[PDB]
Structure of Lon protease:
Amino acid sequence: LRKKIEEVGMPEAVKTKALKELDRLERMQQGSPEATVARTYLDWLTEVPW
Amino acid sequence: LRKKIEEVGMPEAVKTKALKELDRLERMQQGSPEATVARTYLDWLTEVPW
Amino acid sequence: LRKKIEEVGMPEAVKTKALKELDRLERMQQGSPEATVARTYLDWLTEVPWSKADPEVLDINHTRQVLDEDHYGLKDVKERILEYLAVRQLTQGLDVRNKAPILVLVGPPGVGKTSLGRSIARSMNRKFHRISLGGVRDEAEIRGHRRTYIGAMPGKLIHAMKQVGVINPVILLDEIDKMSSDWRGDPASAMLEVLDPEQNNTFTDHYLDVPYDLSKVFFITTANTLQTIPRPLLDRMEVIEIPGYTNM
Amino acid sequence: EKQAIARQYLWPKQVRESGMEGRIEVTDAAILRVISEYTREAGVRGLERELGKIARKGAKFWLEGAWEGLRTIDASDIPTYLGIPRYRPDKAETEPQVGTAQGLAWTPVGGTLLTIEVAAVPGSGKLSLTGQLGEVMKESAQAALTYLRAHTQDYGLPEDFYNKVDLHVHVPDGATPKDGPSAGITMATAIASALSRRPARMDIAMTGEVSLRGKVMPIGGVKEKLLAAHQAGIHKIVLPKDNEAQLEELPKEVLEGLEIKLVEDVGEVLEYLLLPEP
Amino acid sequence: PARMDIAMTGEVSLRGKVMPIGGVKEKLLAAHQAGIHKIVLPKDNEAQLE
Amino acid sequence: TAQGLAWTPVGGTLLTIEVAAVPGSGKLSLTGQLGEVMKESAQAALTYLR
Amino acid sequence: LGKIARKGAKFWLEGAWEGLRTIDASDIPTYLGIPRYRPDKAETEPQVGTAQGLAWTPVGGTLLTIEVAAVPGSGKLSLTGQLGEVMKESAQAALTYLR
């Protein structure tokens, strides 16, 4: 997830919140959407072209 | 069920999510939905034909 | 309650689920919700006797005599009943299977529906019951409330079974036109299911887990509105028009 | 086709329902009696229930007394099992009626006979649209009126009725259920019978479309109009001339009762449905 | 003035014809409680007199 | 004034019609939550009368 | 073209009459229905009543034979088709010319 952020050439107005959802980690997916919506929104951030 | 997740032929990520249903349980079987929600969801994705 | 399961005769599925809810016992029985709801399901099941029947009449002539003694036949409603029972003496394949509705009753408010049902239970030589349907808030007087914890309400049908001893009563279904439920989904589904002849043999509730075999039992139904009923309750529901009464 | 559905698959289903196998037997005009009498549906639901009730009365009448194992039910005694005719056995019997134009249409749960009735008063010259009409039946009626005002020497009418006869028109289902104003020669027949004060013939249904030169223009879905006439018991149908083309793709079972009198100018549908024409 | 103790049910047409009625015996249940001794009916529901 | 017979599925009941033929202009007045089919049969009533 | 194509698959796989096939004119109403629209509207024995405008339609143009029924009577002007006034304007204008 970290490399996908740093092989797209993004604005730092993106990479700020990219590193924010890199900060929001270490939680549950099986108990709640807590790292689900985190990782999937973050992968939206990765896979749109900059 | 932990016998059946093998036995219930499934795709790979579905087997994965089924083990995650296994892991979010094993602490609730008296439970108000926290047992029954993952128990009926394990029972559904065992009894859907793959 | 451990002795109770082989104290009371059972079918295999009732026996096995009784053994199951025996097994979830033998701890604290004042809290700890698996134990208390196992005790309730063990009582509501095992105190239903089995392996015995009412006399099932095979005689419309007996039936035509018995029914014509509480009110006096009323020239149309009797012989529709006699038709339904006439195919009951001509069950296909020599097994008593229905493949047919269960004679839901509508009429004016005040005619002898109770007299009809109990009179049938005499004429069919069966044990009458009537359980809670007319104006219910959730499937706990109609159907089951789901277990593994107490707060689950038993079946009033299971109460009629714990009150009866036998395997063929006449379960009255009163005023199903106002049957409501707080449970998402109609109990009319469990109506249209159970009335097909081989669906009661495998039937459960949310209160029932292993198939509580309701197999050998004729059912009957009353209500009092001519227009409004669920659409699945117009298959396997044989509406018989009941009239009011005049001066003679 | 309904009868053959019966004898091949339906009626043995019912006498296997009621356990009476090797006990009851059933004729030609028995099934044809249940068909032309005790249902006017558009499928075969009602026939399976009525054969159910024949099966149950067979259970009782064999039950309390069991003599015969070869019960023949013919077309003379079925009211023992079922009762009164709920319908006309024949719609060849319905006696030329005044304001009645037998419509043909397709109520989309099954073919109908949308009998428009129209009542002609004395009065001031005005059209009333009862039965919850849209504009559509008003303007087709207006077209039929303008055609008729082009031709008042024929129909006995005095030449200036339109100023002195108010019109009251009743339409069951007062909008187009098929979504089509295809009751043109229907309302032409109704209005010409209503204002001519002369009875429109029963037993010949008609369907079409009229326009202001006096033209029976073509319609859509000819098969379903012919099946509605075939279910609901009518025999002669009146269709536009511009449907010779749709007509000959029809599977030749469908065509085997019907007797079509093809028209294109509205004088020719109106020479057939009125016996006292002016 | 109309008449007394004579009641009625029936459908009229815009030609003015009695189109027959359904639930005849039921109407006589609700009506012949009210004791009205002469009730007028459509001609076609002699079919439910019998 | 004319009495109305009906069935009602609450148990049987009755009706009465009350008509005030007021000095007016042909313009039909209906009161008592009178249904549209009563309006149309009123049209047919006055029309049959015409 | 789809209906031609699918019935081509039908008449093929009942049993192949060939290895390569051909369809020319009037080998169509086998493969299709009745021909829905007759050929050019010239064929049609010119009508006593009505000529035929071209017209806009917001999903692209078409023809519109505007039928007119001169009905002997009072002296008025109706307009069926539930027109606006704008046709009554144009009808009265054309009528004025003719007057």
